[PDB]
C-alpha cells in the first residue's frame, strides 16, 4: 500500500505512486521523471490523468504507450491549475525532463516535492524565492557527510581529456560508455564532440534519446555503429568479458577499448581527487569509474535546505531503516540550529 511520503495532504494527489494499483482518494497522479523506480506500474492500460513535464510525456507516449488522452504535460516555471489547486513545475537538475513540484494548497500551506534532484544555487532564483514553504519532501539519497563529489563540469573535463589523449595516441582505440536509464547524456555527448564522432547505439536507445528535445541530437547520435568511435552499451556489459566480446564484434576495426562507468558515488572519493583517478586494466581494455552524480552531495543538500528554511522535512530516500531515519533527523536538527530557523 502507498507510503505516506507519496501522498500530498489536502489534495487528491499522489507523486511517483504507480505501483500500488488504484490509490484510494487519488484524483491525479504526478510523475516527477522517467526512472523505473518512479514510473513502475504505468502502461497503455492506465486510464487516470498523469501530470508531468513535456519530455516525460514524450517518453510515456513513445516508450510505455500510454494513451495521449491521459497525458497532461505542463510547461515549466508557469503557474497552472490542476483540479482546483495551483501548481508549478521547476527544473530538478536530475535527468532530462525531471521536475520538482510546488503545490499551493487551498488553506495557504505551500509544499515543495523535490522528486530526485541535484541542488544548485541557480534554484535560489526560480519561483522558489517568491514565497515561504511549509513542508519539503526531500531527495535524501546522499544525506551523510561522507558523500562529497566533484562538480559535473570537473568530471566532464576529466573524461574529455582522457578520451582525447587515448584516441590521439591510438587512432584505432574505441571508446565505450555504459548506460541503463536516461540521465548522464553529457558524458557520452561531450566525448563524441571532442573526437569529431557521433555516438553509436541500439535502435531502442536512439528512440529514447529522440524523445528528449536535445538540440542537434540528429547531429550527435546514430544507429550506425560502423561509422562511430564512441559506442553506448548497457551498463551490465561494462566489464572485461562484455567488452572483450564487443571488441570481437567490431571485426578488427579496433584494437583497444577505453570504457567509462559513470557511477553516483564510490568510497574512492573520500581519499582521492578527480585528477588522481585511475582505471582498472586487463590486456587492451581499460575501465574508468567516474563520479558523475545527478543527486545532491551532502553539502549541496544542506545549503539548499538552510536557504529554503522549511517548517517540516519529509525524507523520500533511505526511509526503510530506523538507523537511517534517525541519522537523517539528527542532520536536519543540526542544520536548523546552525542556520537559526
- Between 63 and 157, name the residue whose CB sits nearer to Ni ion: 63
Q: Smallest gap, in angstroms, from Cβ of residue 56 to Ni ion?
A: 12
Q: Smallest gap, in angstroms, from Cβ of residue 37 to Ni ion?
A: 7
- Between 96 and 310, name the residue whose CB sits nearer to Ni ion: 96
Q: Pick from 144, 177, 204: which is nearest to 292 by CA?
A: 177
Helix (H) or strand (E) holding 200: strand 199-200
Instruction: Point out which span in 24-32, 44-52, 109-117, 150-158 binds Ni ion (CB under 5 A).
Output: 109-117
Helix (H) or strand (E) holding 232: strand 230-234
- Between 120 and 193, name the residue whose CB sits nearer to Ni ion: 120
- Between 99 and 195, name the residue whose CB sits nearer to Ni ion: 99
- Between 35 and 113, name the residue whose CB sits nearer to Ni ion: 35
Cα–Cα distance for residue pair 219/232, rounded to 1 Å: 16
Q: Are 52 and 31 in contact (CB under 8 A)?
A: yes
Distances (CA, A) of 334 to 121, 130, 204: 21, 26, 46
How many residues at the interface with Ni ion, by CB under 5 A? 2
Report the site for Ni ion in 210-239 (rule: CB under 5 A). none
Nearby residues of 283 by Cβ (< 8 Å), 6 or more positions away: 240, 244
Q: Smallest gap, in angstroms, from Cβ of residue 28 to Ni ion?
A: 21
Eight-class DSSP state of 69: G
139 binds Ni ion (CB under 5 A): no
Interaction mask 16-55, Ni ion, x per CB under 5 A:
-------------------x--------------------
- 72 has which bridge partners? 51
- b or e along 30-56 (b: 16 or more beta carbons within 10 Å of the residue's beta carbon)? bbbbbbeebbeebeeebeeebbbbebb
Q: Smallest gap, in angstroms, from Cβ of residue 33 to Ni ion?
A: 6
Q: Smallest gap, in angstroms, from Cβ of residue 161 to Ni ion?
A: 28
Interaction mask 279-298, Ni ion, x per CB under 5 A:
--------------------
Report the site for Ni ion in 112-131 (rule: CB under 5 A). 116
Q: Smallest gap, in angstroms, from Cβ of residue 60 to Ni ion?
A: 15
Instruction: For residue 113, count other CB atoms closer than 10 A to its CB.
Output: 26
**Residue 177 main-chain phi, psi, to 5 deg:** -125, 130
Which residues of this protein are in contact with Ni ion, per CB under 5 A?
35, 116
Amino acid at each position: 500500500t502507498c507510503p505516506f511520503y507519496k501522498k500530498i495532504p489536502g489534495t487528491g494527489f499522489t507523486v511517483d505512486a504507480f505501483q500500488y494499483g488504484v490509490v484510494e482518494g487519488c484524483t491525479a497522479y504526478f510523475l516527477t521523471h522517467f526512472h523505473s523506480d518512479h514510473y513502475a506500474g504505468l502502461s497503455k492500460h492506465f486510464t487516470f490523468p498523469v501530470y508531468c513535464s513535456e519530455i516525460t510525456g514524450n517518453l510515456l507516449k513513445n516508450k510505455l504507450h500510454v494513451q495521449e488522452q491521459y497525458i497532461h504535460p505542463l510547461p515549466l516555471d508557469t503557474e497552472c491549475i490542476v483540479n482546483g489547486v495551483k501548481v508549478v513545475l521547476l527544473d530538478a537538475n536530475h535527468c532530462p525532463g525531471a521536475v520538482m513540484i510546488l503545490f499551493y494548497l487551498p488553506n495557504g500551506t505551500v509544499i515543495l516535492h523535490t522528486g530526485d534532484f541535484r541542488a544548485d544555487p541557480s534554484m535560489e532564483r526560480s519561483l522558489l524565492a517568491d514565497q515561504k514553504v511549509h513542508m519539503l519532501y526531500l531527495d535524501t539519497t546522499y544525506c551523510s557527510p561522507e558523500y562529497t563529489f566533484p562538480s559535473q563540469q570537473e568530471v566532464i573535463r576529466f573524461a574529455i581529456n582522457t578520451a582525447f589523449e587515448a584516441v590521439t595516441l591510438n587512432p584505432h582505440a574505441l571508446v565505450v560508455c555504459g548506460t541503463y536509464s536516461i540521465g548522464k547524456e553529457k558524458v557520452f555527448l561531450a566525448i563524441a564532440d571532442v573526437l569529431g564522432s557521433k555516438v553509436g547505439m541500439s535502435q531502442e536507445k536512439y528512440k529514447t534519446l529522440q524523445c528528449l528535445n536535445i538540440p542537434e541530437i540528429n547531429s550527435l547520435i546514430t544507429t550506425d555503429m560502423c561509422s562511430s568511435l564512441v559506442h553506448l552499451l548497457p551498463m551490465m556489459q561494462i566489464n572485461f568479458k562484455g567488452l572483450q566480446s564487443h571488441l570481437k564484434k567490431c571485426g578488427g576495426k579496433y584494437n583497444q577499448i577505453l570504457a567509462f562507468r559513470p557511477t553516483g558515488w564510490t568510497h574512492s572519493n573520500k581519499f582521492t581527487r578527480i585528477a588522481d583517478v585511475i582505471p582498472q586494466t586487463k590486456g587492451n581494455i581499460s575501465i574508468y569509474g567516474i563520479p558523475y552524480s545527478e543527486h545532491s552531495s551532502y553539502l549541496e543538500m544542506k545549503r539548499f535546505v538552510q536557504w529554503l528554511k522549511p517548517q517540516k522535512i519529509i525524507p523520500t530516500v533511505n526511509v526503510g531503516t530506523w538507523k537511517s531515519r534517525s541519522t537523517m533527523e539528527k542532520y536536519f536538527r543540526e542544520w536548523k540550529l546552525e542556520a537559526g530557523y
